[PDB]
Structures are given as C-alpha cells and as structure tokens.
C-alpha cells in the first residue's frame, strides 16, 4: 500500500541525516576562528538614482559593471548609467505588476516578468532606435518570481507554481521543467559556470539542479520559513539563503549541509535580498527593517550597516568587478554604495 | 562633459519629462483589489490578472482580480480591497470569516481598508423564510442573539431576515474591530445580483478612505 512506500522515505530521510553527520568533524566557526576580523565597513552613498514613481521590486547589474536595469510597479524598466546617473532607456511594460528583471550577459536583452505569468524579453540595441518586445514566454501557471540569463537564447525562470523552467527564446517553448518543490519558488541563482542553479522556495527548502539533465541533485533543509533570496558563493561551491525567519544560512554543495548561520537578536525582520562580494568575505543582506547588513561570511560577525532607505529594501546587487553595491527600496529610490 | 555626454544628459532629461507626465495620469486613478472565494459572484458586481475599468463622477477606478500569501505584498499601495462574500451558503461562511481575518491581520495590508459586499442577500431571504436551514446549526451564538433595536434601518422586510442579516455583518465587523488600531476601516454593504448601485458605493467609500488619509497627513486623526 501507500504506507509501505511512505515508510521507505522515512528510512532514507534518516539515512541521509545519518550519513551527513559523519562529515561534521568540525564547524566553520572553529576553523576560521584564528583569522583576523574584517573590521568596520564604512560605505557611503555615492549615487542616488531618481525617476521611479513607485516601489522598486528588482534590479540587475550588467557585466560591464556600469549599466543596471531596474523594475518598478509604475510599469517601467529604466536602464541607468550609474557613473553619470543618466537614463539610457525607459521601457514601458504591458503589465505594471513586475517582480523580476534580468540583464543579459551580452547586454542586448533585458527580461521582465511578474503577476502576468509571462517572461517578456526586450531587444535593447536594434534599429528603429526604440526598445521593443522580442518574445513573450508563456506556460507558467503561477506568477514569475525570478529570471536569469545563461545566453542570448537561453533563460531560466522561477514561478509561483512550484516549478522552474528552462526556455529556448528562438523556439519560444520550455525545454526543461524542474519539478520537486511543494511551494512557490521565490528566487534562484546561477552558478558561475552556468551548469548548475539553486532554487529557494516557500517550503523552507533549497534545491540544486542540473541544467543539462533536469534533476534535483541535492535538497537542503535548514530554514524554518519562506526562502526569499539566494546567491552562490563566487567559488561556485556554496550558497547563502535568506528567509522570513531573520536568518541567513550558508550551505556547502560538496559536504551537503549548512556551515554557518547569520542571526542576531536585534533583527526580527525577514531578509528580502542577499548578495556576496567579489571574494566572498562579505555577505550583504537586505531586510524589511528599512536597512541593509554586511556580515563577515567566515566569522559570522556583523561588519557594518547600510542605512539609507525610507522603506523596505527590496533588491541588492554587487558589480562583477566589486566596485559598487546597489540597493533598491519600496521608497522608489536606488543607491550606489562603495 | 563632452559633446556626446552632454547630448546623453539632454536625452535623460526628456525621459524624465515623460516619466513625470505618466505619473500624473497614474496619480488620478484609484486602484482596487477584488477578493473572494468562488461562488461569491465576484465578477458580477460592477455591472493571471483581469483588469477592469469603471469611472464614476468623473473619477477613474481600476479593479484587479488574480486568478495568495505571497503576491499580496504587491498590493500594499491600493486604495481599497473589495471583499465579496456570499451570505447564503452557511457552510462556507467560516472559510469567508477566516479568509477575511488573514487579509485584515496581514502585515503588508495594515493600512489598507476593506469594502465588504455581502452577495446574494436575495438568496439569503429565501433560506431564512423557507425555514429548511437554520443558522444555529452552523453558528451556535445565533440563538442567544437579539436584533439591535437602535440599528433598525430595515425598510419593508421581515425581522427574521434582518436578524439573520445583521448577525452575519457582526461576524465580520468584529474581526475588523479586534486588531485594527484605527489605521484602517471596514465598510459593510449588502448587495444582490441585480444591484446597480455598486459603483457608487465603492466611490462613496473611497471618498472616505481618502479623507482619512488627509486627516492623517495633517495630524488631525
């Protein structure tokens, strides 16, 4: 009967748990205890980008570390020249309910999506001077949470229908459907080799997928609320997660369990965005309490604070050259910190 | 600034001139969110997103319904949430009262008011006059409940219907008075399927919502 099959799951769930405790000979805190603390990180707002007339839900940097894309509920994508604070483009959107935005690695395309269940791809640089829709990708039965590019014709999306999808934009149809989550998927991060990606879902689980195959290689369960953010370590062998339980956690792919927890009794608000620095020594997380925190990723000690926003900090990014950090908030502003 | 950087700056100024112009059109439209379980007649009141536009007294209204604990954070800056409840199907009123509690007590909707249309007050009249079904089986407190003598706006209807009516309204207003802190209000109405006065009631309610926003800008309330 179904009880026999359900009994085998409990056997393995304790076999994985047992075989995972055979690897915890020491903790990350003991090993990195005798390394000098980073210090106090004093970052000042170098730019403020004005022009959005509603809340900002997503931003994404460019590989050139100079251009970035921003999404807002006013229904407009703006591409900014962060050095000069100029507006390169303003892209009107069919739906005002935008939750995600991606900037293609080549820079030719920007993606968007949200409550319309459609990932819309935009051709930035083309004749006619203007930005126009190249493809509307349909097929998800829930809202679109995050989208990231692997190539000009290769994109991964996460939706509230408990699934992630791999698309071919030239064909316009799903190539792989990643199934295995029992709740909405709120974030995903792409490995630096573009051969793996992690997904954080509202079932308090994080799953590592193989893009070429379409399988869930590992499942990580250490949180206790919805996972809202996720980000790979620069090495590609670890990732950090952010949850509504006011904790950031570090997970190792090779050992396959959690290495560190970033909590503090003063913080009781959830984490909206998470990001690493170029070397991995700093973990930056945005919070609902109007401000952002900078943690030491090896000693778990707070290393500073970025307090400059008048509402919820919704997005957070670090440039590929590590020169700048950009935050966005529901107060309709972006800020470049250095 | 070079010749090209100067020309880029002038382009950036013209994008602003159009962002603000669009913001002016955005400021004069009132956004609403429609909620309610199936069998609520939700889509038949003003007679994954289905936008609906109606205007009353030269004021533009804009209604969205999604076809939820996560995406509800998007609608943190709406004028009102319209909650539509069938007052006839006594089985699922508990689901309606629990649906309403979670929306009222939600962290991102702490300053969003709720307009409460109780659909199918004509079907309720049938079930309360026919006698086959009784509220007391589903809500035990009905038996020990007496109609308020003061609150008697009942024009030409049986006191049995008005007892049945005002009890269902209490079960929703009490959830609103429990944990509200005065920052947001619930407005309870009573609408059938042939009701045509609906667009006005949303309007007359939004005019009060906006008044209470201005009384909080000037520290008056």
């Amino acid at each position: 009967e179904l009880d026999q099959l359900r009994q085998e799951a409990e056997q393995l769930k304790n076999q994985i748990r047992d075989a995972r405790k055979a690897c915890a000979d020491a903790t990350l805190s003991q090993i990195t205890n005798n390394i000098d603390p980073v210090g106090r990180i004093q970052m000042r707002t170098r730019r403020t980008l004005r022009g959005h007339l509603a809340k900002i839900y997503a931003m994404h940097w460019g590989t050139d570390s100079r251009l970035l894309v921003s999404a807002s509920q006013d229904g407009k994508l703006i591409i900014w020249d962060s050095y000069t604070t100029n507006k390169v483009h303003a892209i009107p959107l069919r739906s005002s309910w935008v939750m995600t935005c991606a900037y293609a690695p080549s820079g030719n395309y920007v993606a968007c999506g949200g409550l319309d269940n459609i990932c819309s791809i935009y051709n930035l640089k083309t004749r006619e001077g203007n930005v126009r829709v190249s493809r509307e990708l349909a097929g998800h039965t829930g809202y679109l949470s995050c989208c990231r590019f692997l190539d000009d014709n290769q994109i991964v999306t996460s939706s509230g229908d408990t699934t992630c999808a791999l698309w071919d934009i030239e064909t316009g149809q799903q190539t792989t459907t990643f199934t295995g989550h029992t709740g909405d998927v709120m974030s995903l991060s792409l490995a630096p080799d573009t051969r793996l990606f992690v997904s954080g879902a509202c079932d308090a689980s994080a799953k590592l997928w193989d893009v070429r195959e379409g399988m869930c290689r590992q499942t990580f369960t250490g949180h206790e609320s919805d996972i809202n953010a996720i980000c790979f370590f620069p090495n590609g062998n670890a990732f950090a997660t952010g949850s509504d339980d006011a904790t950031c956690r570090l997970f190792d792919l090779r050992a396959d369990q959690e290495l560190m927890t970033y909590s503090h009794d003063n913080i009781i608000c959830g984490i909206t965005s998470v990001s690493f620095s170029k070397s991995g020594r700093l973990l930056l997380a945005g919070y609902d309490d109007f401000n952002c925190n900078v943690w030491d990723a090896l000693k778990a000690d707070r290393a500073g604070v970025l307090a400059g926003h008048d509402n919820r900090v919704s997005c957070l990014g670090v440039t590929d050259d590590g020169m700048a950090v950009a935050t966005g908030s529901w107060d309709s502003f972006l800020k470049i910190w250095n | 600034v070079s010749a090209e950087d100067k020309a880029a700056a002038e382009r950036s100024k013209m994008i602003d001139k159009n962002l603000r112009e669009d913001g002016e059109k955005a400021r004069r439209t009132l956004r609403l969110l429609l909620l309610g379980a199936d069998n609520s007649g939700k889509s038949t009141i003003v007679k994954g997103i289905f936008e609906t536009k109606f205007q009353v007294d030269k004021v533009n209204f804009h209604m969205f319904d999604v076809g939820r604990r996560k995406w509800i954070q998007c609608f943190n800056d709406v004028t009102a949430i319209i909650f539509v409840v069938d007052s006839s199907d006594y089985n699922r009123l508990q689901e309606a009262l629990n649906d309403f509690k979670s929306i009222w007590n939600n962290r991102w909707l702490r300053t969003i008011s709720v307009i409460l249309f109780l659909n199918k007050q004509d079907l309720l009249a049938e079930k309360v006059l026919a006698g086959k079904s009784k509220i007391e089986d589903y809500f035990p407190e009905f038996a020990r409940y007496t109609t308020p003598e003061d609150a008697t706006p009942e024009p030409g209807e049986d006191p049995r219907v008005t007892r049945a009516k005002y009890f269902i309204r209490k079960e929703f207003v009490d959830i609103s008075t429990a944990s509200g802190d005065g920052r947001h209000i619930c407005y309870p109405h009573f609408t059938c399927a042939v009701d045509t006065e609906n667009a006005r009631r949303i309007f007359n309610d939004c005019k009060d919502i906006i008044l209470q926003m201005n009384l909080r800008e000037y520290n008056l309330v």
Epitope: E128, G129 | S2, A3, A8
Partner: single-chain antibody, 231 residues
C-alpha cells in the same frame, strides 16, 4: 530605415531655399539630426545640428545667422531654410541621424542628399591623399589632430567614414575602436590622442572609396581632407 531628401536645384545668389528630408522607418523623435554638405569635388563639411526635442541647435560659422534648422516631429520631416545664399553654399546636402546615450553609435544612417547649385576649431589632417593598393593586402589609413581627442572619461571621439563612388557615406568605426553594425570584422581601429590609424586587413573589392575621419570632441564637428583608396 530611410532618409529621403527634397529641395535642391539652381538658385540665384542672395535667394532662399528650404531643403527638406523625410524619415520613414525609425523613431525619428528619439534621434538628433545633423546636416553635412559636400562641395562638388571637396570633402565633407558640417552645417547644423538639431537635438531631440529641438532644445539644442548648433551651426557652423559659415552658415551661422543665415541658415535655420528645424524639425516636424508629427510629420517626420527635417528642414533647413536658406537666407542670402552664396557661391560657397554649393554642395550636396546630406541628412544624418544621430542618437546619444552610453554605448550608442552616432552618425549611423546617412540619407542620399540633394544637390544645390547656387550660381578655436580642431583641425585634423590626413597626411596621405591617395593610396594605390593591391586586393587582398592589408592597408593602413592614418589621420592626426591638433589637440588630443581622448577625454577625461576615457572615450576617444574619432569616427571613420567610407564613401563609395556615387553613394552616401556610412560609418565604420565609432570612438576609435568600435565597429558599426553590419561592418565586416576586417576593419580595425587604433591610436592615441593626436595619432590614429585604420587597418583594413584582407582587402576586398566593394571597399574602395574616400575614407574620412571626424572628431566629435566639441563643436563644430571637423572632418578630414579624405584619403581615397584606388585599385
């Protein structure tokens, strides 16, 4: 994308004319439009510029005070009104669209022009004037300037143009290094301030003409004498 011009024809000295160009195929309003003329046998000379929104207008000193530039955004048409024409105002007038933002390619499209037959400054020089070359062989075209074209923001504002016989000029290299859209990868650009070169590796036919180098550092926009390549 098209830029078709009207007007032209013989005009007596001291007269007036209104040259007009019509756009069809691109967002004409988001583009700045230039006027560049070319005497019957001389090089390219820049006349006027009107920005998007018409909020910025520049003229060359030759035509200042007596030529007026204007645009009609709803009708997609660019104008140039003449007053007190001269014997030095004889040329073929070209219409150029230019778009300015970060990473853009200005001077992309040139419309085939109209012929009018009326009956300090950054001087920058192309020392060579004619290069007789063999097909398939790499050729190098070099022009220099009076002052450095390298700005404080790292952009070297120099543009390379090509004019095939009986054809409008088109863009090859913008900002000393960047190829235009549709240009073969055999073209290349290099140089420092006041020293520039254009290398055409693996030369081929349909690539012979007069090569122009322009500065965009500041107005007036100064072109070069023009180095032509013949078989």
């Amino acid at each position: 994308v098209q830029l078709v011009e009207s007007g032209g024809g013989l005009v007596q000295p001291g007269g007036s004319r209104k040259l007009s160009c019509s756009a069809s195929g691109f967002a004409f309003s988001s583009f700045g439009m230039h006027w560049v003329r070319q005497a019957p046998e001389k090089g390219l000379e820049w006349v006027a510029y009107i920005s998007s929104g018409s909020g910025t207008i520049y003229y060359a000193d030759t035509v200042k005070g007596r030529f007026t530039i204007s645009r009609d955004d709803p009708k997609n048409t660019l104008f140039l009104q003449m007053t007190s024409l001269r014997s030095e105002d004889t040329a073929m007038y070209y219409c150029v669209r230019s778009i300015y933002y970060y990473g853009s390619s200005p001077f992309d499209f040139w419309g085939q022009g109209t012929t009018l037959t009326v009956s300090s400054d950054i001087v920058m020089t192309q020392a060579t004037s004619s290069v007789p070359v063999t097909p398939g062989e790499s050729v190098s075209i070099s022009c220099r300037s009076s002052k450095s074209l390298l700005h404080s923001n790292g952009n070297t504002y120099l543009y390379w143009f090509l004019q095939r016989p009986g054809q409008s000029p088109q863009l090859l290299i913008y900002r000393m290094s960047n190829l235009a859209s549709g240009v073969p990868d055999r073209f290349s650009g290099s140089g420092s301030g006041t020293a520039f070169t254009l290398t055409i590796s693996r030369l081929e036919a349909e690539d012979v003409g007069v090569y122009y180098c322009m500065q965009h550092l500041e107005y007036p926009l100064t072109f070069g004498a023009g180095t032509k390549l013949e078989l």
